[PDB]
A paper describes a structure:
The second pathway involves the sterol-regulated inducible degrader of the LDLR ([name], also known as [name]), which is an E3 ubiquitin ligase that promotes the ubiquitylation and subsequent lysosomal degradation of the LDLR. Two distinct protein domains are present in [name]: an N-terminal [name] (band 4.1/ezrin/radixin/moesin) and a C-terminal RING domain. In contrast to secreted PCSK9, which interacts with the LDLR extracellularly, [name] is a 45-kDa cytoplasmic protein that interacts with the intracellular tail of the LDLR via its [name] domain. Here we present two crystal structures of the [name] domain of human [name].
We obtained diffracting crystals for two different constructs: [name] [name] domain, which spans residues 1–344 (FERM344), and the third lobe of the [name] domain, [name] (residues 183–283). The [name] subdomain crystallized in space group P212121, with cell dimensions a = 56.37 Å, b = 69.54 Å, c = 74.32 Å, α = β = γ = 90°, with three subunits in the asymmetric unit and a solvent content of 43%. The [name] conformation is well-conserved between the FERM344 and the three copies in the asymmetric unit of the [name] crystal structure. Moreover, there are clear differences in the F3c′ region, where the FERM344 crystal structure has an α helix (α7), following the [name], which spans residues 279–300 and folds back onto the [name]. This region has lost helical conformation in all three copies of the [name] structure, and in one case ([name] monomer B) even the previous helix α6 is partially unraveled. Because the expression construct used to crystallize [name] has an incomplete F3c′, helix α7 is unfolded and helix α6 is shorter in all of the three [name] monomer structures. In fact, in two of the three copies in the asymmetric unit, this unraveled region contacts another [name] molecule, where it takes on the role of the interacting peptide. The unraveled peptide binds in the [name] peptide-binding site, making an interaction that closely resembles the β-β association observed in many [name]-substrate peptide complexes. This confirms that the [name] subunit is intrinsically capable of forming the peptide interaction observed in other [name] receptor interactions.
Residue numbers in the entry: 186 to 283
Write the structure that this text describes.
Amino acid sequence: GIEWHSVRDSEGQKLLIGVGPEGISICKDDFSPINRIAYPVVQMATQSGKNVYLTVTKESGNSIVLLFKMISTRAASGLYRAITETHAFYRCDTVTSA
């Protein structure tokens, strides 16, 4: 079901990002879980060439940025689209009586 994307963190550690129904899943290359990020916590998503940045809200109230380095601009666009468009499936909104 979930589409896993190959990324590298700030240090260079190989990770796997899984975009699912509840949110973002961060794992190691052997799929061992590390952390999970729910979509309401995700404030923003940014793409700068091969890189993808995420603005995450903390339970404290403040916002911090997560960096994900990728092999190509098409790989980054694939992860950016996954976070942005599976949000147009998570966060739905329309009129009823038109």
